[PDB]
Ligand binder design. Sequence first.
Ligand SMILES: *[C@@H]1O[C@H](CO)[C@@H](O[C@@H]2O[C@H](CO)[C@@H](O)[C@H](O)[C@H]2NC(C)=O)[C@H](O)[C@H]1NC(C)=O
Ligand SMILES: *[C@@H]1O[C@H](CO)[C@@H](O[C@@H]2O[C@H](CO)[C@@H](O)[C@H](O)[C@H]2NC(C)=O)[C@H](O)[C@H]1NC(C)=O
Ligand SMILES: *[C@@H]1O[C@H](CO)[C@@H](O)[C@H](O)[C@H]1NC(C)=O
Ligand SMILES: *[C@@H]1O[C@H](CO)[C@@H](O)[C@H](O)[C@H]1NC(C)=O
Ligand SMILES: *[C@@H]1O[C@H](CO)[C@@H](O)[C@H](O)[C@H]1NC(C)=O
Ligand SMILES: *[C@@H]1O[C@H](CO)[C@@H](O)[C@H](O)[C@H]1NC(C)=O
Ligand SMILES: *[C@@H]1O[C@H](CO)[C@@H](O)[C@H](O)[C@H]1NC(C)=O
Ligand SMILES: *[C@@H]1O[C@H](CO)[C@@H](O)[C@H](O)[C@H]1NC(C)=O
Ligand SMILES: *[C@@H]1O[C@H](CO)[C@@H](O)[C@H](O)[C@H]1NC(C)=O
Ligand SMILES: *[C@@H]1O[C@H](CO)[C@@H](O)[C@H](O)[C@H]1NC(C)=O
Lengths: 243, 199, 50, 50
Amino acid sequence: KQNVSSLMRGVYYPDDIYRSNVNVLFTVPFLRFNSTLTWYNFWNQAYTSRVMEFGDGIYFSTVDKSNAVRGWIFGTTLDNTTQSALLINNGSLVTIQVCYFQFCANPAFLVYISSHNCTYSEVLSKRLREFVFKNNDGFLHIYGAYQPHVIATPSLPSTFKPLIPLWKLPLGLNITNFKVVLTFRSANFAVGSLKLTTIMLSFDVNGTIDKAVDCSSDPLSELKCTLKSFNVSKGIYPTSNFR
Amino acid sequence: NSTSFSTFKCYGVSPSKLIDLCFTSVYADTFLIRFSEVRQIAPGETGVIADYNYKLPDDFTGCVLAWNTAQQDIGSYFYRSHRAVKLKPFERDLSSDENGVRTLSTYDFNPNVPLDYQATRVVVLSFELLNAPATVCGPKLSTQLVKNRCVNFNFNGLRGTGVLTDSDKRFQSFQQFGRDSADFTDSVRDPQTLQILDI
Amino acid sequence: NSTSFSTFKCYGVSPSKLIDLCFTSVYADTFLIRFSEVRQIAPGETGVIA
Amino acid sequence: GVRTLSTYDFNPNVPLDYQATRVVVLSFELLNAPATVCGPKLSTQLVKNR
Ligand SMILES: *[C@@H]1O[C@H](CO)[C@@H](O[C@@H]2O[C@H](CO)[C@@H](O)[C@H](O)[C@H]2NC(C)=O)[C@H](O)[C@H]1NC(C)=O
Ligand SMILES: *[C@@H]1O[C@H](CO)[C@@H](O[C@@H]2O[C@H](CO)[C@@H](O)[C@H](O)[C@H]2NC(C)=O)[C@H](O)[C@H]1NC(C)=O
Ligand SMILES: *[C@@H]1O[C@H](CO)[C@@H](O)[C@H](O)[C@H]1NC(C)=O
Ligand SMILES: *[C@@H]1O[C@H](CO)[C@@H](O)[C@H](O)[C@H]1NC(C)=O
Ligand SMILES: *[C@@H]1O[C@H](CO)[C@@H](O)[C@H](O)[C@H]1NC(C)=O
Ligand SMILES: *[C@@H]1O[C@H](CO)[C@@H](O)[C@H](O)[C@H]1NC(C)=O
Ligand SMILES: *[C@@H]1O[C@H](CO)[C@@H](O)[C@H](O)[C@H]1NC(C)=O
Ligand SMILES: *[C@@H]1O[C@H](CO)[C@@H](O)[C@H](O)[C@H]1NC(C)=O
Ligand SMILES: *[C@@H]1O[C@H](CO)[C@@H](O)[C@H](O)[C@H]1NC(C)=O
Ligand SMILES: *[C@@H]1O[C@H](CO)[C@@H](O)[C@H](O)[C@H]1NC(C)=O
């Protein structure tokens, strides 16, 4: 329930188009460097139900001891008044069902009992498994990374990771509220907060993201966004107003 | 044959070039409105349909295709007119009593109804074109690949002029064309007998 | 009088300036179609008539 | 080989789209030539040195 720092762990692919050997700027939702998280741990007595805010996208993370997290519920009232997403991972299939849900108190496996008027139903099919969820023009973009996380007192690594864009969904739904489904048998999950940020992204010959800048936190980052480069010669330079 | 389109307006592309292009993916939003409210389905416009029922994004690239039919659909339909906040683009709302009162009003459709108040079927085809293997593509037949001649080529809707030469450039499993120098397509992949051709 | 012009669209010139201009030569292509297919008679367009 | 010309009917009691519309496309050109078809504006007196 304590606070840690985002050690450059929120960089994703903003546009679906292909680019290589270029450094380009963006004004996208992003999780800036040295940010705060709200990660909760699982004990013998622990969290039951909490609605944390889905503020124009969320950065989800876990460490995933065995199979602890099962998925997410995206909605705006969490009743059978407005439909909800309910991403689950039962068996070995990941499914999404935008229906009207009268779900129970705490979402657990061994999540919902009543579901009517489904508008969408699709079957898709110490590990980090970090995700970025965002909603733009009626589309739910999910960016996932299956990192083999290192090893207790938990924290976050410093290795850069270009989160690979996974499948996106044509849901047609507005989301402002969010709930995590766990496993209750009679681990850690982490919550970020996306915000509008100008960033600079580089690409290699393979289309992979090399490094990020996030010119809203540091003067050197603002200098790197100003001069359109990642290596800056010695001297004095006027800078723009990216902060 | 037997379907006369009252409105076929394409933003981003042209209706004269829909044959030549292969789309990566296409979605079709389908609904039915009054005849005078067809003009509201355009990017950057407000009304009762473009504010409270169905809004279009400002970066739209698609085709609105609407046709009048006052005889096929007879009855009563529902529409929203009393929402507190305007919708975000490509969003849906089904709360009938979000204000407490009924926010969904009815409107009838008979053949013997005046001019503006008649049923029009609208399909909004939103497709995107990018560097990906296409799924929906045009009806134009292929031709024989000829090399070492200055030819006009149409590779998946990437029209160009040049000489195609067999090359061994490094592509991914999803790449269809190669950007080089100042954003020039000079390495492409033929869709039949997949190999790398340098322009 | 007695003719209501449903569509008068001029490309290259304007309908407000047709008085001021003398044309070297004029041709008139005349035909009759359905009411919804009038919108296809414009440069750069496809349909059945176009 | 087959008949490529299809028929369509015209009655007064027909819906919106399927009604007759008369189309005239006036294609004229303007260049360095003595004009034939010209506008209805009357001439004035030629005045010089003003
Ligand atoms: C008129 O439209 C109809 C259907 O909209 C076309 O009918 C089809 O024609 C093909 C080949 O001629 C047949 O194989 C199909 O079985 C027909 N469909 C039916 C009868 O439902 C017809 O070809 C069109 N005619 C013209 C001249 O465009
Ligand atoms: C209304 O339209 C009619 C026909 O287009 C015009 O009638 C002509 O009028 C002129 C002079 O007024 C006569 O020399 C013609 O013989 C008439 N044509 C006929 C009767 O076929 C009439 O002038 C128009 N009226 C107005 C007010 O525009
Ligand atoms: C975030 O860290 C601050 C200390 O800088 C702390 O006061 C706050 O409680 C933390 N947030 C949460 C949700 O624990
Ligand atoms: C970000 O957070 C880490 C860990 O708290 C800290 O050591 C570092 O100085 C901060 N700033 C930057 C620019 O990395
Ligand atoms: C879901 O609908 C049922 C209808 O029988 C109702 O009893 C229940 O309270 C609803 N759930 C809510 C409002 O959360
Ligand atoms: C998982 O849920 C889906 C959705 O109903 C169902 O079709 C499937 O059989 C389930 N699999 C298991 C192993 O429970
Ligand atoms: C829910 O489903 C029933 C069964 O078809 C339908 O009559 C009802 O209209 C649906 N609810 C809404 C809000 O459309
Ligand atoms: C999402 O929709 C609900 C119901 O339509 C509304 O109450 C809420 O304000 C919306 N949230 C937005 C637009 O952020
Ligand atoms: C691109 O991938 C290849 C492996 O196929 C690797 O050898 C090469 O180093 C990669 N390029 C970069 C810039 O990482
Ligand atoms: C059919 O598709 C395969 C797969 O690319 C291709 O190799 C083959 O040449 C195609 N045949 C024809 C006749 O288009």
